[PDB]
Design an enzyme around this catalytic site. Structure first.
Site, short mmCIF file in Angstrom:
data_model
loop_
_atom_site.label_atom_id
_atom_site.label_comp_id
_atom_site.label_asym_id
_atom_site.label_seq_id
_atom_site.Cartn_x
_atom_site.Cartn_y
_atom_site.Cartn_z
N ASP A 35 0.83 -1.21 0.00
CA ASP A 35 0.00 0.00 0.00
C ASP A 35 0.87 1.26 0.00
OD1 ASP A 35 -1.88 1.93 0.35
OD2 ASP A 35 -2.48 1.32 2.39
N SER A 199 -0.76 15.58 -12.01
CA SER A 199 -1.01 15.22 -13.40
C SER A 199 -1.27 16.48 -14.23
CB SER A 199 -2.20 14.27 -13.47
OG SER A 199 -2.60 14.01 -14.80
C1 LIG Z 1 -11.95 -3.62 2.32
N1 LIG Z 1 -11.47 -2.86 3.51
C2 LIG Z 1 -10.35 -3.52 4.21
C3 LIG Z 1 -9.15 -3.43 3.34
C4 LIG Z 1 -8.53 -4.28 2.51
C5 LIG Z 1 -7.39 -3.63 2.01
C6 LIG Z 1 -7.38 -2.42 2.59
O1 LIG Z 1 -6.46 -1.42 2.63
C7 LIG Z 1 -6.81 -0.16 2.17
C8 LIG Z 1 -8.11 0.14 1.79
C9 LIG Z 1 -8.35 1.38 1.23
C10 LIG Z 1 -7.29 2.25 1.07
N2 LIG Z 1 -6.04 1.98 1.45
C11 LIG Z 1 -5.82 0.79 2.00
O2 LIG Z 1 -8.45 -2.24 3.39
#
Ligand SMILES: CNCc1ccc(Oc2cccnc2)o1
EC number: 3.4.23.22
Length: 330
Positions: A35, A199
Site C-alpha cells: 500500500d 497530473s
Molecule cells: C476492504 N477494507 C479492508 C481493506 C482491505 C485492504 C485495505 O487497505 C486499504 C483500503 C483502502 C485504502 N487503502 C488501504 O483495506
C-alpha cells in the site's frame, strides 16, 4: 541488494493485490497488500481476536526465534474506505522477493474491522508511503522500504500491476524490459506523507486532451481512480445510461456498455487506461447495473490514482534524497 516479488489480484475484479512476504525465523509466509498510501506493516496474528479471523494466515511471534516485543509500542490505523485495525508491535526479520530487512517493525493486530475479517485473502498490509505517516506510538517506526533503502542498489521500488493477471513489485532496480518507451519522471510533495504529484490533464476516449493540473496521490492500496467531479462527469457523460447513484455510492453504468478509455498526463507524456479496466462488474450479484472504476474524489479531500490508473503503467517510486515518481507505458 535487490528484491523481486509477484503480486496477484485477490479476485476476478482486481479489487486488491497480494504479495507474499516472509516474516520471522523459520519463515512464516503471509500474503500482504502493498500500500503506497499508508506506512504501517501490520498482520493478522496469534493475538488477533479469534472471532475476527476468518481464513487469514496468521503470524505467530512466539514461533519466531528472531521476534522481539517492542515494549510499550501500540498502533492504530483507519483507512479511506472506513476500515481499521490496531494492536501491539514486534520487531522481526522480513523478506520480500529475496530482499531482507532485520529489525523491521511488524505490527500485530489485536483488532481488525469487519471488512478485513471478510477478506480472507489479505493477511495484512505492507505500507510504502513515507514513514512520517507510521502510526506506532510512542516511537514511530520506519517502513520496509525506508529500512531497506541504504542497502538497495538504487533507492527505488517499482509497481507493475496486472489487469486481471499477476504483476511485479521490484526493490532496488528498474527492469528495463518491463515497459515500453521511456519513463517520465515528475515531482513529488512529501508534505502530507504520500507520493503526491500533479497530473498535467486528461482525455476521454479519442477526445482532445484537456491541459489542467490535477494534484493527487499514487496509491496502490486504493482500488479505483478518484478524480474531481468535473473530470468524472466528463468521462461518464460518454457512456449511454451512466449515472451517479446515491444509493449505490457512485457512478454506475449498464453492464452491456463498452467503456471508453481514459488518458492521464504525466508531464508531456500520456498514460492510457483501457475502457475495460474501468468496469468493476455488477453492483450486486446478477444485476445489469455495473460499478464504475472512475469515481469522484469530492468529499475525500484528495485525488487518488489507485490501481485502475497505476495498472496501466510501469510506476517508479524513486526514494532518492528528493523523491520523484516515474511513469511509463507498458
Ligand atoms: C476492504 N477494507 C479492508 C481493506 C482491505 C485492504 C485495505 O487497505 C486499504 C483500503 C483502502 C485504502 N487503502 C488501504 O483495506
Amino acid at each position: 541488494s535487490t528484491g523481486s516479488a509477484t503480486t496477484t489480484p485477490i479476485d476476478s475484479l482486481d479489487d486488491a493485490y497480494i504479495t507474499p512476504v516472509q516474516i520471522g525465523t523459520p519463515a512464516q509466509t503471509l500474503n500482504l497488500d502493498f500500500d503506497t498510501g499508508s506506512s504501517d506493516l501490520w498482520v493478522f496474528s496469534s493475538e488477533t481476536t479469534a472471532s475476527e479471523v476468518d481464513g487469514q494466515t496468521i503470524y505467530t511471534p512466539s514461533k519466531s526465534t528472531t521476534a522481539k516485543l517492542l515494549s510499550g509500542a501500540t498502533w492504530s490505523i483507519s483507512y479511506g474506505d472506513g476500515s481499521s485495525s490496531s494492536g501491539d508491535v514486534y520487531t522481526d526479520t522480513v523478506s520480500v522477493g529475496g530482499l531482507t530487512v532485520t529489525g523491521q517493525a511488524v505490527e500485530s493486530a489485536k483488532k481488525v474491522s469487519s471488512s478485513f475479517t471478510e477478506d480472507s485473502t489479505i493477511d495484512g498490509l505492507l505500507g510504502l508511503a513515507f514513514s512520517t505517516l507510521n502510526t506506532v506510538s510512542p516511537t514511530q517506526q520506519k517502513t520496509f522500504f525506508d529500512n531497506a533503502k541504504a542497502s538497495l542498489d538504487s533507492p527505488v521500488f517499482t509497481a507493475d500491476l496486472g489487469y486481471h493477471a499477476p504483476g511485479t513489485y521490484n526493490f532496488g532496480f528498474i527492469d528495463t524490459t518491463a515497459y515500453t518507451g521511456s519513463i517520465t519522471y515528475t515531482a513529488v510533495s512529501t508534505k502530507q506523507g504520500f507520493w503526491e504529484w500533479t497530473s498535467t490533464g486528461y482525455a476521454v476516449g479519442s477526445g482532445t486532451f484537456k491541459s489542467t493540473s490535477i494534484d493527487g496521490i499514487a496509491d496502490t492500496g486504493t482500488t479505483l481512480l478518484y478524480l474531481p467531479a468535473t473530470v468524472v462527469s466528463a468521462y461518464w457523460a460518454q457512456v449511454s445510461g451512466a449515472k451517479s447513484s446515491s444509493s449505490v455510492g457512485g457512478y454506475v453504468f449498464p453492464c452491456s456498455a463498452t467503456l471508453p478509455s481514459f488518458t492521464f498526463g504525466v508531464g508531456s507524456a500520456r498514460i492510457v487506461i483501457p475502457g475495460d479496466y474501468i468496469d468493476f462488474g455488477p453492483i450486486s450479484t446478477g444485476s445489469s447495473s455495473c460499478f464504475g472504476g472512475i469515481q469522484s474524489s469530492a468529499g475525500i479531500g484528495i485525488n487518488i490514482f489507485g490501481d485502475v490508473a497505476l495498472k496501466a503503467a510501469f510506476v517508479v517510486f524513486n526514494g532518492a534524497t528528493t523523491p520523484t515518481l516515474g511513469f511509463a507505458s507498458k
